[PDB]
Point group: D2
Chain length 496, copies 4
Amino acid sequence: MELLKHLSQRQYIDGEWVESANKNTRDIINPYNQEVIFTVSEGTKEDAERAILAARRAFESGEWSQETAETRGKKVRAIADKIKEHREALARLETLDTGKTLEESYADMDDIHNVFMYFAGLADKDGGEMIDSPIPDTESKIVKEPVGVVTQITPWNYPLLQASWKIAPALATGCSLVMKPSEITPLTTIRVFELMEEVGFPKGTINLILGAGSEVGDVMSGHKEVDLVSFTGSIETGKHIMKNAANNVTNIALELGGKNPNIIFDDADFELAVDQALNGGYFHAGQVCSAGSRILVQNSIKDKFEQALIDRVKKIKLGNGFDADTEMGPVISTEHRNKIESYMDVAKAEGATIAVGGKRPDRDDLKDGLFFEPTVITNCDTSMRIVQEEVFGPVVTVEGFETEQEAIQLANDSIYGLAGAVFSKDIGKAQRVANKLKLGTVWINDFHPYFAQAPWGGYKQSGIGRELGKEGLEEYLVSKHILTNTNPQLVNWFSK
Amino acid sequence: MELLKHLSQRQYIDGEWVESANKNTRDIINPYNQEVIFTVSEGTKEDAERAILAARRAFESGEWSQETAETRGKKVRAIADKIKEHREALARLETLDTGKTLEESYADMDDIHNVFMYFAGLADKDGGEMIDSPIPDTESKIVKEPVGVVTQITPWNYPLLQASWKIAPALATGCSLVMKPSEITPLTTIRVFELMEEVGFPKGTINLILGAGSEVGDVMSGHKEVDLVSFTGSIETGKHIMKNAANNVTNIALELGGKNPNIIFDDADFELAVDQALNGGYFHAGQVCSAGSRILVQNSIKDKFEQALIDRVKKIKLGNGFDADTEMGPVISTEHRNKIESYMDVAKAEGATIAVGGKRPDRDDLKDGLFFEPTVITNCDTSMRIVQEEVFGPVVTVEGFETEQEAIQLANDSIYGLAGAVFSKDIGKAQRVANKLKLGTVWINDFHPYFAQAPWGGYKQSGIGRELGKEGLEEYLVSKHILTNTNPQLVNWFSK
Amino acid sequence: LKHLSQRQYIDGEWVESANKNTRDIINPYNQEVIFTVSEGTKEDAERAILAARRAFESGEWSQETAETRGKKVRAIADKIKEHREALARLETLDTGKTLEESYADMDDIHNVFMYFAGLADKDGGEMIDSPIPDTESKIVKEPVGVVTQITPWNYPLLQASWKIAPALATGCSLVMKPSEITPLTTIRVFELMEEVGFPKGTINLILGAGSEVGDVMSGHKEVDLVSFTGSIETGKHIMKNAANNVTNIALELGGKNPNIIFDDADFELAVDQALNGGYFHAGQVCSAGSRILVQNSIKDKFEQALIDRVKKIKLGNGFDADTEMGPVISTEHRNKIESYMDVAKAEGATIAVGGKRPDRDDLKDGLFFEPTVITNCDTSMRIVQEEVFGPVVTVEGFETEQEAIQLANDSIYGLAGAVFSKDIGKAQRVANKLKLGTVWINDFHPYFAQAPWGGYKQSGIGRELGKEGLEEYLVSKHILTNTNPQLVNWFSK
Amino acid sequence: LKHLSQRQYIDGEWVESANKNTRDIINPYNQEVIFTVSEGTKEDAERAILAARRAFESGEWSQETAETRGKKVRAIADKIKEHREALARLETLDTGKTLEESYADMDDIHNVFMYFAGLADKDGGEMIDSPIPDTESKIVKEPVGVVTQITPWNYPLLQASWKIAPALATGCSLVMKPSEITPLTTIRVFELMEEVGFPKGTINLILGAGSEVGDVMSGHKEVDLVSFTGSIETGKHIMKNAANNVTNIALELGGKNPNIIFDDADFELAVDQALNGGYFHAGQVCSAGSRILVQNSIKDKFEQALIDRVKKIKLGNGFDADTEMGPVISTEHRNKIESYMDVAKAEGATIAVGGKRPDRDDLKDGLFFEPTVITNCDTSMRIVQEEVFGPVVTVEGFETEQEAIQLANDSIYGLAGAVFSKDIGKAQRVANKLKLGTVWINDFHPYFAQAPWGGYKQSGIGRELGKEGLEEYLVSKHILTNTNPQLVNWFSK
Ligand code: NA
Ligand code: NA
Ligand code: NA
Ligand code: NA
Ligand code: NA
Ligand code: NA
Ligand code: NA
Ligand code: NA
């Protein structure tokens, strides 16, 4: 609330903070108490178009795209340093806007600093290749250029974190960008734009559009001046975005959700597996792309595991993200909580058991917030909607498996392929399983870790492309083969 | 006609040569005389589905996907050697099916051998990376795996050449593939499948579907078991394919056409520029993705250039591709010639001049074939359909430019971005221009060269992704981050 | 042998030694002379180097396209496979090892040439995003130049391939000298390369151990890289000579390679692989597992099992199907191995089995030495620290993982080693702490063209095989173009 | 200077020489003693190496995350920028070059540390697709280990940064010894690194005579890499000493760098850059353009223009803004330069201008030597072939592109050179044929952290700067895991 008195309420287009063309606004809510905490501009499709045209003009001017990579790196580093400088206020703003614990928000800010620092350091480390040409008297080189004008659409769960994954490489490579954060969580994205403006970028290089205005998304994914659309969010919206991008054969990078398996063998460190099953299921109330919502446990220890998990779930502390004792905050919005609630009905109707949770808590200090109890669903199977579909809430399912081969078959039996884990003290076995899982990231005896040094993304319906790592940077580059004939001679194919 | 008596007429699905499920067939035509030369199976959508399921079963069996990269390379090399062994018959078959000169077909076969040889040698050279992890007591590695099941759709202009650009990296990386060549030019693709069978691949690893059956394309682009759709062809079909691929968030690699500029400065080697303008415009009767259909010539030499080009165009020798004196063969089909013809009407109506050509030739030996005269269109400008749209025939437009800046502006003023050239003895100038052109390939003082060592593909509406080179191989790989916690400890976030 | 060349190959011609001297080549199985070859002079070596320089400067190979160089290297690979049987037989005849081991070599050799053939045209350098506005910066990779290559007697053609393949793929000119006692397969491979066809002077073969031949090959001013595989003493001398012209050196010297067996290893696997590590090629392997380190809890069991198996090892003619271990290479080498037995006993170690020449009648004429196990020894002993390079292993116990690592690293060497344990996590921890170029987990011996091979510490400098191996034969050039040059005007006008 | 340390830095402590010996440091502008520092012993050097080894083995820096190591290297970069003024002044005081040149050095140094900071966490090694079924193959890149670093007097802190930055980024422990005559900025950077904070023994600074501690730094068994920048004679000695333990060497020695000026060069640009190439830092630059090669048709015009400009070069105190060229480094060095003038005249060359100490009163107390142009010389002469390393250039003519290339490559060196021509295609053709680590087209002198720097032939071994520079400080380990180990059963059961 302190920081909010100085935070911008506007969009940032072509070097200026500007309101919506029609003066529309949106009230931003704190999910802990459903109170309005801020009011921001709700931009129009014409605003989005203007931002894209500004990004294109800036790209063509070359002020950023032709800046030295070393200098671009120094600027990205300056953003990183600002994130660290404002770590406390940023973490508080993120907890206020998204509801997650302040400790989780601090962790995000540490990661965000590291993301910008990594890409700053990567900016000037390539440039392309020299090719030994198969044609005598020619020089062949591949030059890597910025892809161009990029549109970036981020989700509500980790707004600034996901923004950093897109902004850092775009700026390091010399692109121009237009970003639109989730309409319900724009606060830390507005703040990072203020911080980037303090660092200084050429007019139009960076643009922030706010809202969920009519056709705003369609303009960001379907405009002819866009070279890459990068979207993180729901599968249905991602598919729509990809179909729109097709209208101009535009590159797409998508990170959609997952149905992430947490595979626990009977020779896992049992108390570790229980601890990490809770962590996988319930960090940020399960509102994580890579949440471990699908637990697969070996039959021999399944009963022991379920009882241990359930007993721990009953003790999870719900409350205000600002209170140090809180272990799990509320879910993000009324609409999202309703969707979670509707999945409980689906689960029961198809024959699954709600072993614990599965409703809103009654406690007085939680009544005004968007809370939902941490939930464990048992007696289910792979045919069920509750197992196959991403609920994106504080909910896990538990299925048993007999053998290593069955664990792999079940884990791969989904439309998704983002991340997962294998818990076993037999590292050779864990490695065998990891090699067979169709997942972008596999953890052995861990759950959740990601970092700027390694690419992240999904097989199958979890996405297209990668974020983070050298591969993440590559989404923002395009290759050009320049072939010079150093002794050109007439071909004389056509008669003289 | 000799080779045709032993050539298969069937599809190749799951290790067997099989007819269409409905026994339908298609007559294949020789464009030189419009005679039926062969009759092949015309497959159904159910055939395509069966091939895809076979490819998936084969992929999951691991017989090819878990074969050593070195051994996969040896097999791809064996295909390369077969291409060379059968060079003469393959070249003849390609000229028979597509109409281009036998000399052009020989060049194709030399290129095809080199494409398979390049990928054979690349197969075992990069399995991923070790990452220095930012988390203590963890090991981080990125493993590159085959992307999975791939569908491959090739065009009629260079059937076997374009097939090799797709097959070679798919097999080198360990993917399973389903290929469908253009319905009007299947002959050399059938033959290469016979040759691959001789080398030996596990059942289902390679599949050939033939036809343009109802919903065949839709199944190949929209099936849930496909991990990558790779399509080379027309922009309208490519967009449709991408939209269908979106239904399962499937990776797409597209190479659509271009409106490829041939930029000739007043300080070019003039006779070289004239020679290469002819080559750019009229190889394969202009039916080249990268044909130099859009000549941009400096105003100072434009009159001289037009006269020199026109005088040469009048001498181009049309005829049978099998006759050694032929310099340009027919176009591919009645439908395609009609499309080219309709553009002549469009050009005149919008105010351009048909300086030479622009009709079917009258000569008696050309009357039965699908010939169209090499054509030069003058007095045109960037606003015109004839300049903006890909005609894909033996037709060039000529526009003038005043300055280097105007040449760049005009060259980039199209929806495409595949390839182009800059002719100037001032290499520094040519490099400045090359750096500003939004094209996947730029030639300086040359026109047409491509090779397996360097990536090929388009900016903007010319495509998504790359073929050839290391980047071409990468389309057929997927990255997996395996993170092992080597000293796992309880996090104890959730109370005990 | 009736058709094999007896000469050196210099500047496109098979030629005798300048002084007509020859050397008799021996089969270690029966000590019979099997062939007679030219014994070259230092002047022959100088002529070869000058021919290699002239060929390099002509550009006929160095400026050939990388793709075409790869095709030629592939053609050599194919000739190896075509002549696999005869090459394997020549290698067994010359070196004494089993025909099965020689076949394995020829498969590896084919694969080495095939790997480098495929690599030849895959990386010409990089484009650098220059920090100076209006400049273009690129790094071009060129062949390093003229290279001299000196190979050992244990795996003559194998070690030759590791050097020849990258040199030819990158466009270098080379002068090779195989071990004076084992030239046969190297002569043959030169015949095969000549059939493929290379410009005159690109490849040259010097034969012998003539006075100063080695010195010329390591110290000549026209050499850009000296690549030597052999003994530590000779390697050091070669490096010192190379210094006279600041010449790049690549060295692979021996090792004291540890074979670490934990009490939770697959016991019969560990015994099997301890035998393999110790006795393949009668232990005449740079990476032989001569130093067994076994956990104390299973040490007695392990020693008894190992010793009982060693007593059954079948010695004989490498051509006989039942032979498991052939003879050692020469009288001098066997004498050196014999002298180490004396050293071992004098410093207090026990010769548990073996430690002498076998008595059997069919082995009496050959250079055989019994597979030997030395027990009750420790890290202070010469028998543990020094590379014996014979069919001899030592056995030391360790208590903990930390002690195994300490002992394993307690040598001047750093080539290769193994860790046997069913606990893969533990094996990985140990592997990370061993100062060794190659570490095997639950295996012993494997190497391949796809991965670099070489030593930490006194085991060498540089790497062979893999992309790193290729890089020894390249040099980087930074070409920086100022595209808008302006006067600096630092100095007064 | 009143607050600058006078001591060595060994194992986390500032310490005097074991024998309390000291050395007086001189300012070449006036030959006045400016500071007195410890003159260490060979035992001090040994103690530093052993401390570096202990620190390496503790893993406090070598097992720190690459990301964290990068942050520390970045912190050093920031300290350099913070203390830019004082560092530049100290460098000018110690070495004599202009303050403006010293500022340029400090900006470069900041960028060198920043580059390597950003590179620290960007590799780690490779995953290999193994040719053996049921095996996992990976190459892990580890710090090479303990490194000794010996730097020259011409650009003390610049050359120190090229060595320190990659060593620290990769996780090595280092022992550095700056030139005995120019230790000031190196002492200062160690004070700054100490403020950033590194584990005890990770960084060590030895001060004094190459003749006392040099052999220990190049010949100690605990060293894994010796990195030396300096004279050819010393570099060779160092390499021979390193051979005693088969130790990796990286050497950057001088050059005889050609400045090739075609008749179609931008003439006034070529004159400007010829002066810059010849006379920055009084020609005391490893890559100084001492060998001018000019096309015959413009040679007379060029010589007249160059000579006329050389007469106007302003000599003086590096702290005075009008100074364009400072003094040479020492009495011994100036004497060596003077002796070359005698050599040049005796072999028939012409001293067209300069060739002696200046007479002006304000220059008499300093180690000044006039900028010199030597004409009428040829490639057979010592004055053309040998590196004088002073404010001296030779001028030779050439007729054709082929002759320019032949002459340019006709030296024992191969560090750097330039080609001036408006015909870029021609310049590129020439650049491709010059045996030089760096070739500038229409420029002279530029280097940067993003691109590797080093010499062909006798100019060195290895590279500094760029990704290749980082690689000198890494070692490859192939870890091969057999994931389904089976008995081989070679030996009888
Ligand atoms: Na909110
Ligand atoms: Na996908
Ligand atoms: Na046809
Ligand atoms: Na596109
Ligand atoms: Na022999
Ligand atoms: Na070494
Ligand atoms: Na001094
Ligand atoms: Na050298």
